[PDB]
Amino acid sequence: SNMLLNYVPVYVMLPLGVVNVDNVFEDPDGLKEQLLQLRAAGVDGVMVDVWWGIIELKGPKQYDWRAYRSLFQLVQECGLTLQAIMSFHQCGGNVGDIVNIPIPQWVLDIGESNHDIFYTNRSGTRNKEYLTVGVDNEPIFHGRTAIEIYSDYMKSFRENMSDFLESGLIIDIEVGLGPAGELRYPSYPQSQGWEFPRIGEFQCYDKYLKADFKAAVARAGHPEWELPDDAGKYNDVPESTGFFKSNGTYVTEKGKFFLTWYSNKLLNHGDQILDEANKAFLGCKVKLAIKVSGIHWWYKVENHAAELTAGYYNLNDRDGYRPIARMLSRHHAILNFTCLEMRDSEQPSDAKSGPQELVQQVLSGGWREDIRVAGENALPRYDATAYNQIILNAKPQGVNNNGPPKLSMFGVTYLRLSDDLLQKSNFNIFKKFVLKMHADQDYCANPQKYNHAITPLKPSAPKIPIEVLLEATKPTLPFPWLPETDMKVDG
């Protein structure tokens, strides 16, 4: 039928701090002209972080939704839909920090007395950006567990914003699952010295994770087994560590057991909280989503080190992403990926980066598991090259002049809405990127037309036992990518 079946929507992410630490919607008039600039270009919607640390600031269950309400009004007045991120993580925190938004101080307060609530590397450094999965179910936060906190927060949101939900402003709810809202471990902390082509460190050292592990190796028949002590430091390179070296420890029955344990905590972390989300939004016309990190560096050495330390147990012969997709499928959730723009020929050669193949692996795995796949660009780009990369990934096999494409992404959330973007020559290319994403059609306000109607969220399907999830580790061949998009921005 209609070319319109080829339309891939486009979202633009709002500026960090649009609502400040103080819970103040700063510059309504300013955002306003911007938002209007966007709607004219043909942007389908926008994406905003909903800081847990601004909202539940004063105390447990002391939520103040006002400044966000004002923000949602204005968006809705601008003819834009909106993706909301349940951000339970810290914003910024390091040097020359744009905005800094820590987590609720009252939580921080508990951590001065119980440090084991933060991710901890082997040296004992406490990462404060996010609560360790080790406390998901520890009723230590004035009677509540962490999952309860997150659950309550999503429930409060649902109720205090029913109007916008009822009215279809909010298209999807992205559930924040770790640092940067990503389902992963804080393995490469800039704040800790991490520099790029660096492998990163495992983050399983808090008392809770350590005790978990030791009980588990004891059940497995090896009480004597300890956490990795040969993995190195953030900035290492893998052949330089006993864990990751060839025939290293990461290939030992003790290392494999470790990695499975460590990666499985994320899966279970995501699964339970997504459970709570499904509860909170049952009935609403929204889709649930999670962000999965694009760790492309070391993708091209057998050991896939940076991925491993992050909790993505992905090897050349063990698919460590498809299990996530599979987990998501019971909640009818979307896998929101990134690094959609990156090309292989753009990386330091000594970083062994495999962004393109990484992307093919992640997307294929989702389509394979029959879920919906979305993504973002990881870094700020303004050139046709980035744009054409993003366009290829979106419709890996090109346009179907005869129907819907056999393969297409569910949406792409461009990164950052700055003055730079809005600059003339820049914006001009953007408009084109927007046109091509839309497959050359005009912006389309009814999503049903291009087969994206949203239905009221249903209850999750039943638990998938880990043994069944783990089956998805079986490697598969990606689907076929065109070498280049048939719909280039660049004439």
From Swiss-Prot:
Changing T338S: Reduces activity 360-fold. This is Beta-amylase. Gene3D superfamilies: Glycosidases (3.20.20.80). Keywords: Acetylation, Carbohydrate metabolism, Glycosidase, Hydrolase, Polysaccharide degradation. It comes from the Eukaryota. Belongs to the glycosyl hydrolase 14 family. Monomer. GO terms for molecular function: beta-amylase activity. One of its GO terms (biological process) is polysaccharide catabolic process. It catalyses: Hydrolysis of (1->4)-alpha-D-glucosidic linkages in polysaccharides so as to remove successive maltose units from the non-reducing ends of the chains. The active site is at E182, E376. Substrate binds at D49, H89, D97, K291, H296, T338, N377, A378, R416. Its EC number is 3.2.1.2.
